[PDB]
Amino acid sequence: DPVTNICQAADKQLFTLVEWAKRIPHFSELPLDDQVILLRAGWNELLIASFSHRSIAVKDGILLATGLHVHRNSAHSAGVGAIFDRVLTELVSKMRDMQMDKTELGCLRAIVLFNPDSKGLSNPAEVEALREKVYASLEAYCKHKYPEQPGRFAKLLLRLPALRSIGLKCLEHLFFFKLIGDTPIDTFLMEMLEAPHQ
Amino acid sequence: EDMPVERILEAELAVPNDPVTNICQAADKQLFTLVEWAKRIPHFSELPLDDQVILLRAGWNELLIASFSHRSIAVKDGILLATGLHVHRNSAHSAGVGAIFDRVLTELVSKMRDMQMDKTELGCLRAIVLFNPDSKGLSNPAEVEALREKVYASLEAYCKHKYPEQPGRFAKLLLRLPALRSIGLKCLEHLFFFKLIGDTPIDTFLMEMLEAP
Amino acid sequence: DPVTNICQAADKQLFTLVEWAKRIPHFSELPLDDQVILLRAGWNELLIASFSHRSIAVKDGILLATGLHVHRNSAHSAGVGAIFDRVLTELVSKMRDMQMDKTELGCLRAIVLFNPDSKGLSNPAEVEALREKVYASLEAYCKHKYPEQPGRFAKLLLRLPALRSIGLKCLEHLFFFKLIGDTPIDTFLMEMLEAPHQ
Amino acid sequence: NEDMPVERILEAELAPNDPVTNICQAADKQLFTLVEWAKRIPHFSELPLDDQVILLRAGWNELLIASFSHRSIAVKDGILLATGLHVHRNSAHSAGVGAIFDRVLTELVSKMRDMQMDKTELGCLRAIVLFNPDSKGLSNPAEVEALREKVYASLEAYCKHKYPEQPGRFAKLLLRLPALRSIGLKCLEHLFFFKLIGDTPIDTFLMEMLEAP
Ligand SMILES: CC1=C(CC(=O)O)c2cc(F)ccc2/C1=C\c1ccc(C(C)C)cc1
Ligand SMILES: CC1=C(CC(=O)O)c2cc(F)ccc2/C1=C\c1ccc(C(C)C)cc1
Ligand SMILES: CC1=C(CC(=O)O)c2cc(F)ccc2/C1=C\c1ccc(C(C)C)cc1
Ligand SMILES: CC1=C(CC(=O)O)c2cc(F)ccc2/C1=C\c1ccc(C(C)C)cc1
Ligand SMILES: CC1=C(CC(=O)O)c2cc(F)ccc2/C1=C\c1ccc(C(C)C)cc1
Ligand SMILES: CC1=C(CC(=O)O)c2cc(F)ccc2/C1=C\c1ccc(C(C)C)cc1
C-alpha cells in the first residue's frame, strides 16, 4: 500500500517545512495570518528547490525526500518529460555547475518564503524588509566565502525566475502526481474492483 | 430495456491527526464509493478490468462533481460534500477556488434544481460519463460506446414516460455535460477537492504549528 | 509575406462567422450585448467544429480555411501532437464514422452559439429557449434522415463535451499559433533582423 | 562597464477597416521596435542569427511587459501603451484580463515607481531577460550566460555608484524578474496583448455588422 506511505511521508515533509520556517529569523514575529499566506504561496517552489539541490549527486534524475530515485525515463513514460528536463537543466545542473552549497540554498528558499507579492498580506512591506535582510546576508556570505566569484550573488538570484515558471508548470501539469502516482493508482483502483461487493 | 434504469437508480441510492493523511483517507473513502457505484451499473463489471480502471481514472472527477452537485439541491448557496460538510461561498473564496464554486452553483446545482432532475436521471448522466469511449487506452472503445448508447436509450425512454409534457427534457439533460466537462477540468488544476476538504485541516494544523515550540 | 495573408484570412473568416450567426433564426432579435457575448464565448468552439468537419476527407490531418493542409507528423513535431490527435479521434474521425452532414453541423454550431452559461447575459432563459428550438429541430431531422439510427441525435450532442475540452486546450496551449507559426515567425523575425542597423 | 557599456544600453532604450489586420500591423510594428532595441544592445548582433531569433521568441513577452510597465510610472490605475493610448483598470476588466492587469500595477509599475527605477536600470534588466541562457535550442548557451554576466556586472557597478546609499538596490532590481516571469506566462494564455489593442476594434466591427443589413 504505497499510497498510505506517501501521505504519511508528506505529513513529515510538511512538518519539517513549517519547523524550518519557524527557525527563520523574525518569521514567527509576522502576523500568523501572514505566516500561513507565505507558506501557502511558497511551499511549491520551496520543495522544488530542495529536491533539485538534493539531486546534484544524481545523474539524469531527481532524489525525492523518501530516498526515491526517479529517472528521466520514468518521467517521460509518465508523460511529464518536458517539465522533468527543465528541472535538470535549469535547476539541478545549474546548481551543480556552480556548486551551490546548503547555505546559499537556504537563503534562496527564505527569499522565496518572504514573498511580498503574495496576495492578501496584511503587511507586505514587513515581508519585503525580511526579504532584504536575507539577501543582504547572502551577499556578505558570497563575498567572503567566494571572493574570486564577484558575480555569484546575482547568479544565485537569477535562478529564481526559472524556479518561478517551473513551479507553475508543476501545478498545471500535475508533475507531482504523475511522477509517482500513475502506476500506484492503477494498483489502487484494481484492488477496489476485486474487493467484495453486493 | 437492456440497461434497466431501475438498476441505475439502485446504484445511486446505495451510495489533530496529520492533515494530509486525513485528506488522503477522505479521498480514498470517496473513490471507493465511486467504485462500488460503478460495479452496480449493469454490464460495467463485464468489461475488462484494465478498461474499468481507465474509465474510472478518466471520469472520477466529473462523477464526483455530478454527485455533490445534485446532492446540494437541498442546501442553498452552498455545496454538500459527501462527508456531510456544508461548504459555503465564503469558505471557498478563502481557499482560492471561489471562481469554480460559483460555476458549480450556476451551471450545475441551479440548473439541476430548476428542472428538478431526479436521481434516476442523475444516475444515467453519470453512467454516460462513466462509459466514455474517448478515454485513452481502451482495448475496445466500441463496446464502451455501445454501453453508452444503451444508457441514453433508456434515459430518453424514461424521460418521455415520466415527463411527457417535456419532450426536450432528454436533450436538456445531455446538454449539462459540456458544463460538467469544463468545470471538471478547472477542479483538477485548482485542486478543488483537495482544498475544500483540506483547506481548514491545513490551516488548523498550521496555526497550531506556528505557535508550538 | 505569409503572415500578413493569415490576418486577411482571419478577417474574412470572422466576417463569415458574424453573417452565419445573423442567419440563425431569432439571433439578431437578441440584445446586441448578448449577441457579442455569445460570439465572444463561442467563436473558439465554432471554428474547431468547422475545420474538424471540413477535414473529414483528410487522412491524419486537418484542413484549415485557407486551404492549408496540416498533417499530424508536422503537429507532433511542433509539440502539440496531443491536442492534434484529440481533434482527429474525438471529432474528425467521429464525424467521419457517422457521416455527419452539413445540416447536423450547422445545428450543433448553433447550439454552441446559444450558450446560456455565457457570463453576463441579459436573459439567460431566452438563450436557453432558442437553444431548445434548435436541438428539437435537429432531432426531427435525425429521425427522418436516419430513422434506423434512433440514437443519432444523442450521439451528436455527446460530441459537445469533447468539443468543449478541446476548445479549452487549444486556448491554453495556443494550438492555433503553434500549428503553423513555428516556421513563419522564424522567417518573420529573421526578416526584422536583416533590416538595416543603426 | 568595459565589456558591456551601460551607456549603449541606455541609448537603445531612448532610441469598417479590417480589425484583425489592424491588430497584426500594430503588433508587427511593436515587435519591430523590440528588435531594433535588441540589435543596439552590445554583442547581441554578434550572436548567430538562429540564436538571436531564439532569444527574441523566448523573451518578447516579458520585454514588452517590462517596457510598458516602466512607462506607466506616471499614470495611475492604468498602463500607458507605446501608442499613447491610456488603458484603465476597468478597460482591462472588460476584456476579462482584470487579474493580470492588477498584477502588472502591483508587482511591476508600483514597485518601479517606489524605487525610482531609471531607464538605465530598466535597460539592463531587459538586457538580462534578453540574454536568457535557459532558452531552448541555443547553439552555445555558455556565451549567452557570459553576456548576461557582463550586463548585471555593469548594472551592479552602476547601482553602487549612482545610489551609494542603497546597497541592496541591485538585488531589489533582480528580484522583480520572477514576478516579470510569472506575469509574462499569464499574459500569453489570456491573450493579454491581443485583447488590449484589439478589444475595441472587435466590438466596433461586431456592433456595426450586427446592426448592418
Ligand atoms: C515532489 C514530492 C517530494 C519531493 C520532496 O519534497 O523532497 C515528496 C516528499 C514526500 F515525503 C512526500 C511527497 C512528496 C512529493 C510529492 C507528492 C506526490 C504525491 C502526493 C499524493 C498525491 C500521494 C503528495 C505529494
Ligand atoms: C494543497 C495544499 C495547500 C493549500 C493551497 O496552497 O492552496 C498548502 C498550504 C501550505 F501552507 C502547505 C501545503 C499545502 C498543500 C499541499 C501540500 C503539498 C505537499 C506537501 C508535502 C510534500 C510537503 C504538503 C502539503
Ligand atoms: C485518476 C486520478 C488522476 C488523473 C486525472 O484525473 O487526471 C489524479 C490527479 C490528481 F492531481 C490527483 C489524483 C488523481 C487521480 C486519482 C486519485 C484518487 C485518490 C487518491 C488518494 C486516495 C490518494 C489519489 C489519486
Ligand atoms: C485554426 C485556424 C483556422 C481554421 C478555420 O477557422 O477554419 C483559420 C482561418 C483563418 F482564415 C485565419 C486563421 C485561422 C486559424 C488559426 C489562427 C492561427 C494563427 C493566428 C495568428 C497567431 C496569426 C490566428 C489564427
Ligand atoms: C480575442 C477575440 C475575442 C474576445 C475574447 O474572446 O475574449 C472575440 C470575440 C468575437 F465575437 C469574435 C472574435 C474574437 C477574438 C478573436 C478572433 C479573431 C479572428 C477570428 C477569425 C479567425 C474567425 C476569430 C477570433
Ligand atoms: C515568438 C512568438 C510566440 C512564442 C512564445 O512567445 O511562446 C507567440 C505566441 C503567441 F500566442 C502569439 C505570438 C507569438 C510570437 C510572436 C509573434 C509576434 C507577432 C505576430 C504578429 C505580427 C503576426 C505573431 C507572432
**Residue D176 is assigned to a ligand binding site:** no
Question: Whose grid coordinates read 500500500?
Answer: A1
What values do phi and psi take at B78, rounded to 5?
Answer: -165, 170
Closest of C177, C186, C191, C188 to residue C78, by C-alpha: C177
Instruction: Kindly state the DSSP code that residue A173 receives in the 8-state scheme.
Output: T
- Among C85, C158, C164, most B C-beta atoms within 10 A, so best to mutate, is C158
Crossing angle, helix C182-193 and helix C2-23, to 10 degrees? 130
CA distances from C95 to C52, C92, C104 (A): 8, 5, 10
Q: Of all helices (H) and strands (E), which one includes residue A61?
A: strand A61-63
Beta strands, E only, B55-201:
78-80, 86-88
Chain D residues whose beta carbon lies within 8 Å of the beta carbon of residue C186? 53
Nearest alpha carbon to residue D83 among D11, D33, D120, D119: D33
Q: Are C91 and C163 in contact (CB under 8 A)?
A: yes
Experimental resolution (Å): 2.6
Residue B80, classed as helix, strand or coil, is strand
Distance CA(D101)–CA(D167), nearest Å, equals 31
Is there a contact between A7 and B24 if contact means CB atoms under 8 Å apart? yes
* Nearest residue of A to residue B95, measured between CA atoms: A40
Burial-class residue B13 by CB neighbours within 10 Å (0-12, 13-18, 19+). exposed
**What spatial distance separates the first Cα and last Cα of chain C, rounded to whole Å?**
24
Residues 6+ apart with CB under 8 A from B1: B150, B153, B154, B157
Q: How far is CA B5 from CA B40, B151, C153, D85, in A?
A: 12, 8, 20, 61
Q: Apex CA B179: angle with CA C151 and CA B161, to 5°?
A: 40
Of C40, C50, C112, the one to substitute when testing ligand 5's pocket (max ligand atoms within 8 A of C-beta) is: C40
Q: What residue owns the CA closest to ligand 2's atom 14? A: A40
> What is the rounded CA–CA span in Å between residue B78 and residue A25?
41
User: What is the phi/psi pair of residue D147, to 5°?
Assistant: -65, -40
Contact indicator for C68, C51 with CB cutoff of 8 Å: no
**D46 CA → ligand 5 middle, Å:** 40
Pairing of strands D78-80, C69-71: unpaired
Name the residue facing A14 among B20, B40, B189 (closest C-beta).
Answer: B20
Distances (CA, A) of B36 to A103, B72, B151, C167, D30: 52, 21, 18, 33, 59
Question: Would you tell me how many other CB atoms lie within 10 Å of the CB of residue C37?
Answer: 19
- CATH number (domain holding residue C43): 1.10.565.10
Q: Which helix (H) or strand (E) holds A69?
A: strand A69-71
Question: Out of A131, A158, A164, whose CB is closest to D182?
Answer: A164
Give the gap in angstroms from C-alpha C18 to the nearest C-alpha of chain B. Answer: 24
Cell of residue A183, nine digits: 502506476
Contact of D145 with D133, CB cutoff 8 Å: yes
The span from the CA of C165 to the CA of B183, in Å, is: 10
What amino acid is encoded at B31 in this protein?
Answer: L
Contact C141, C107 (CB under 8 A): yes
Cα radius of gyration (chain C) = 19
* Distance of CA C80 from the midpoint of ligand 3 (Å): 24
Q: Which residue of D has its CA nearest to C39?
A: D206
Q: Distance between CA C44 and CA C175 in Å, rounded?
A: 11
What three-state secondary structure class fits B184?
A: helix
Ligand 2 within 6 A of B202 CB? yes
- Asked whether the beta carbons of D70 and D14 are under 8 A apart, the reply is no
In the DSSP assignment, the letter for residue A71 is E
d(CA B149, CA A90): 49
CB contact under 8 A, A117 and D134: no
Candidate of C64, C70, C188 to mutate for ligand 4, largest count of ligand atoms within 8 Å of Cβ: C64
Report long-range pairs for C80-85 (Cβ below 8 Å, ≥24 apart): C80/C173, C80/C175, C80/C178, C80/C179, C83/C166, C83/C169, C83/C170, C83/C173, C83/C175, C84/C175, C84/C179
Residue A4 grid coordinates: 498510505
* Ligand 5 neighbour D202 (Cβ under 6 A): yes
Whose cell is 471561489? That residue is: B98
- Spatial separation of the C-alpha atoms in residues D187 and D61, rounded to whole Å: 8
Report yes or no: B115 and B33 within 8 Å, Cβ to Cβ: no
CB contact under 8 A, C18 and D203: no
How determined?
A: X-ray
3-state secondary structure chain C: CHHHHHHHHHHHHHHHHHHHHHHCCCCCCCCHHHHHHHHHHHHHHHHHHHHHHHHHHCCCEEECCCCCEEEHHHHHHCCCHHHHHHHHHHHHHHHHHCCCCHHHHHHHHHHHHCCCCCCCCCCHHHHHHHHHHHHHHHHHHHHHHCCCCCCHHHHHHCCHHHHHHHHHHHHHCCHHHHHHCHHHHHHHHHHHHCCCCC
The residue whose C-alpha atom lies closest to atom 25 belonging to ligand 5 is C43
Q: What is the rounded distance in angstroms from the CA atom of residue C104 to the CA atom of residue C108?
A: 6
Helix axis angle, B49-71 relative to B119-130, nearest 10°? 150
Cβ C141 vs Cβ C18: under 8 Å? no
Helix (H) or strand (E) holding A62: strand A61-63
Cβ–ligand 4 distance for C15 under 6 Å, the answer: no
Does residue B1 contact residue B157 with C-beta atoms inside 8 Å? yes
Distance of CA C164 to the CA centre of its chain: 10
Residues 6+ apart with CB under 8 A from D93: D101
Compute the distance between CA of residue A12 and CA of residue A110 in angstroms, rounded to an integer. Answer: 20
User: One-letter amino acid identity for A65?
Assistant: A
Q: How many domains does chain C have?
A: 1
Report yes or no: A101 and A142 within 8 Å, Cβ to Cβ. Answer: no
CA-CA distances (angstroms) from residue C11 to A116, A124, D173? 44, 46, 42
Alpha carbons within 13 A on the beta-carbon side of D110: 13
**Contact call for residues D68 and D80 (beta carbons, < 8 A):** yes
- For residues A149 and A152, give the distance between their C-alpha atoms in angstroms, rounded to a whole number: 6
- Closest Cβ–Cβ partner in A89, A136, A165 for D181: A165
Report the neighbours of A using a cutoff of 3 or more CB pairs below 8 angstroms: B, D
CA separation for the pair A177, B101 (Å, rounded): 24
- Exposure b/e, B147-172, CB count within 10 A at least 16 = b: bbbbbbbbbbebbeeebeeeebbbbb
Using DSSP's 3-state secondary structure scheme, residue B40 falls into coil
Retrieve residue C2's grid coordinates. 505569409
Tell the burial category of D143 from Cβ atoms under 10 Å away from its Cβ (0-12, 13-18, 19+).
middle
Give the torsion through C-alpha atoms of D112, D113, D119, D123, to 10 deg: 10
Length of chain D equals 213
Among the bound ligands, the one closest to the CA of B57 = 3
State the closest ligand 6 atom to the C-alpha of C6, by its place in the atom list counted from 1: 23
Question: Is residue B51 helix, strand or coil?
Answer: helix
Are A158 and D168 inside 8 Å of each other by CB?
no
Per the DSSP assignment, residues forming a β-bridge with B80 are: B86
Q: Is A54 annotated as a binding residue?
A: yes
Record the cell numbers describing residue B26, joined without a space: 477522505
In angstroms, the CA A104 to CA A96 distance is 13
**D213 CB contacts (<8 Å, ≥6 apart)?**
none
The residue of chain A with its CA nearest to that of B211 is A28
First CA to last CA distance, chain A: 24
Ligand 4 centroid – CA C6 distance (Å): 7
Which single residue is written with the C-alpha cell 555558455? D142
Q: Residue D88 — φ and ψ, nearest 5°?
A: -105, 165
Number of other residues whose CB lies within 10 A of the CB of residue C101: 13
* Cα–Cα distance measured from residue A149 to residue A143, given in angstroms and rounded to the nearest whole number: 8
Distances (CA, A) of A29 to A20, A23, A24, A138: 15, 11, 10, 21
Burial of A195 (0-12, 13-18, 19+ CB in 10 A): exposed
Residue-number span of the structural domain to which B149 is assigned = 1-213
Q: What are phi and psi of A63, to 5 degrees?
A: -105, 105
DSSP string, chain D: --SS-HHHHHHHHH----HHHHHHHHHHHHHHHHHHHHHTSTTTTTS-HHHHHHHHHHHHHHHHHHHHHHHTTSSSSEEE-TTS-EEEHHHHHHTT-HHHHHHIIIIIIHHHHHTT--HHHHHHHHHHHHS-TT-TT-S-HHHHHHHHHHHHHHHHHHHHHH-TT-TTHHHHHHTTHHHHHHHHHHHHHHTHHHHHTTHHHHHHHHHHHHH--
In this structure, the residues whose C-beta lies within 6 A of any atom of ligand 1 are A 6-7, 9-10, 13, 47, 50-51, 64-66, 176-177, 180-181
Ligand 5 centroid, distance to C35 Cα (angstroms) = 13
Residue type, D152: Y
**For a pocket test of ligand 2, which of A33, A43, A109 has the largest count of ligand atoms closer than 8 A to its C-beta?**
A43
Nearest Cα neighbor of A116 from D43, D11, D107, B48 is D107
For ligand 2, atom 9: residue with the closest CA: A40
Q: Do D149 and A151 touch (CB under 8 A)?
A: yes
Which residue, among D86, D82, D107, has the nearest Cα to D181 in the 3D structure?
Answer: D107
Tell me which amino acid residue C113 is: L
Q: Is B118 helix (H, G, I), strand (E, B) or coil?
A: coil
Beta-carbon neighbour count of residue A132 at 10 Å? Answer: 18
Q: Which three cell numbers stand for residue C88?
A: 482527429
Residue contact B148–C135, C-beta within 8 A: no
Report d(CA A95, CA A104) in Å as an integer. Answer: 10
- Cα gap B135→B201, rounded to integer Å: 34
Do the Cβ atoms of D189 and C171 come within 8 Å? yes
Cβ distance C7 to D24 less than 8 Å, yes or no, reads yes
A197: buried, middle or exposed (CB in 10 Å: 19+, 13-18, 0-12)? exposed
d(CA D149, CA D136): 19
